[PDB]
Each structure stands twice: as C-alpha cells, then as structure tokens.
Amino acid sequence: MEKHLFNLKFAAKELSRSAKKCDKEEKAEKAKIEKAIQKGNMEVARIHAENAIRQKNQAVNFLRMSARVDAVAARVQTAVTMGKVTKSMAGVVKSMDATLKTMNLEKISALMDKFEHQFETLDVQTQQMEDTMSSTTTLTTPQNQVDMLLQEMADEAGLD
C-alpha cells in the first residue's frame, strides 16, 4: 500500500518541478524576445512571444495539477497512518485481553492481601531479630551511659 502513496507524492513533486521549469523558461523567453525585436524582426518576435505565453499558461495548468494531486496525497497519507494506528491498537487490545484472562482481577487482589500478610511477617521477623541481636551485645551499651551522653549533647546541643 505504501507504494501508491510514494508514487502519488512523487507525481506531485514531479508536477511542481516541471511547472517550475516552464516558468523559468518563460522569463528567459521574455529576454530572448527583447533581443529578437531589437533587430526589427516581426516573425521570430512572433513565435517567441507565442512560446512565452504558452509557457506561462502551462505553468498555471501544471501547477494546478500539483495542487489537487497533492491534496489526494495528503488524504492518502492520513489513510495509511490511520491504518497503522488501527492495527497496533487492535494489537494492544488483544494481547492485553488474553493477559486479562489469566490476570483477572480476583487473582490479583488475592495476590495483594497475600502481599500484606507476607511483608507483615517480614516486619515481625525484623523486630524479633533485632531484639535478640540487641540483647546479646547489650553489655557494651549501658542505658545509664547513653542517658548521660545524650544529656551531655542535649544541654550544649546548639551552643557549639
């Protein structure tokens, strides 16, 4: 499908370029007319005048085609990108669906209260551990000593 989009854009840019040439030729042809009629030739001056004119009207005609073809090119662009979005969206709806069948909310919620209970047990493990761990080395940290220390750095705390 892309192939046709690319050919349309190509045809558009094509028409623009050709129109551009015909216009350029038009200007050059004015110049050439002036050189011609400078001699006093009334025939060459004629067919040059003529080719100048046709170059200009061709410029109009081509450039018009460039317009309309460009428009269709735009809408085709929209059509393709729309296509991509549609496909990909179908993709997420499906994968998410078949992953919504085994992930259906009940199993999740269960997994979550299971979660609460779980790390709750983590916390009690922690607490227990730190009780025995702090009652084994506790000879090296009297309560009294810590009291007088904390007081020591209390009264003078911000005095430096």
Site for a copy of itself in 45-104 (CB under 8 A): 47, 50-51, 54, 58-65, 67, 69-72, 74, 76-79, 81-97, 99-100, 102-103
Q: Is 141 in the site for a copy of itself (CB under 8 A)?
A: no
Q: CB 149 → a copy of itself: shortest distance, Å? A: 15
Q: Is 43 in the site for a copy of itself (CB under 8 A)?
A: yes
- Among 112, 148, 149, 150, the residue binding a copy of itself under the rule CB under 8 A is 112
Q: Is 37 in the site for a copy of itself (CB under 8 A)?
A: no
- Among 17, 34, 115, 151, the residue binding a copy of itself under the rule CB under 8 A is 115
Size of the site for a copy of itself (CB under 8 A): 88
Q: Is 156 in the site for a copy of itself (CB under 8 A)?
A: yes
**CA torsion, ordered 40, 43, 48, 52, to nearest 10 deg:** 100
How many CB atoms lie under 10 A from the CB of residue 59?
19
Q: Is 126 in the site for a copy of itself (CB under 8 A)?
A: no
Cα separation, 85 vs 79, whole angstroms? 10
Q: Is 30 in the site for a copy of itself (CB under 8 A)?
A: no
Q: CB 52 → a copy of itself: shortest distance, Å? A: 10
Cα separation, 5 vs 62, whole angstroms? 20
CA–CA distance from 105 to each of 96, 112, 113, 155 (Å)? Answer: 13, 11, 13, 58
Region at 44 (left for phi over 0; alpha for psi -120 to 50; beta for the rest): alpha
Tokens of 149: 């220390």
Q: What angle do CA 108, 112, 118 make, to 5 degrees?
A: 140
Q: Is 125 in the site for a copy of itself (CB under 8 A)?
A: yes
